[PDB]
Structures are given as C-alpha cells and as structure tokens.
C-alpha cells in the first residue's frame, strides 16, 4: 500500500499477473494513479485501479516507479528537504 515517511512517500503493490506493458502509473496533482489491464480472446479480462493522495510537498517531477522481477511495483518520490 501507501507509506508516508518523513522525507518521502512510497507505494508498493503486488502486480504479478500483469506484464509491464499492461501497467500504467500517472501523477495528477496530488493524486497517484496505478492501472493494470490484461485482456485476451474463450475471453479473459482482468484489471485493477488504485488511487492514492500524496502530500503537497512532493515534487511530481521527482516521482519514479519500478517493477521487481517478483511482480512488485513501487512508486516513490522525495518530499522537499532541508
């Protein structure tokens, strides 16, 4: 889920049923969105959508995301410091 810390935030999500091209992470103002969609056609569809609010002292430009080989997606960013 979402973890706020003193100098950063981080979101960690299990996405093991999705390949990278089926995943999208977006920042809109102080909202982070994560979407996953997998379809194939004898028809299978699965999707998810998560939204979290982030504190206003996070610069959206410094927000990054990575996907571990075990299917854990991380989204994180520093908060303004010093």
């Amino acid at each position: 889920g979402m973890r706020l810390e003193k100098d950063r935030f981080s979101v960690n999500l299990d996405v093991k049923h999705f390949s990278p091209e089926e995943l999208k992470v977006k920042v809109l103002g102080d909202v982070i969105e994560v979407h996953g969609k997998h379809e194939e056609r004898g028809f299978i569809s699965r999707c998810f959508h998560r939204k979290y609010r982030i504190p206003a002292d996070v610069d959206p430009l410094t927000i990054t995301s990575s996907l571990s080989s075990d299917g854990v997606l991380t989204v994180n960013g520093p908060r303004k410091q010093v």
Binding site: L23, K26, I63, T64, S69, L73
Partner: peptide, 9 residues
C-alpha cells in the same frame, strides 16, 4: 498529468 515510466528493478 505526468505518466511515469515504470522501469526494471
């Protein structure tokens, strides 16, 4: 609306 690149980890 920043789409954020999901990188390898």
């Amino acid at each position: 609306e920043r789409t954020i690149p999901i990188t390898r980890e």
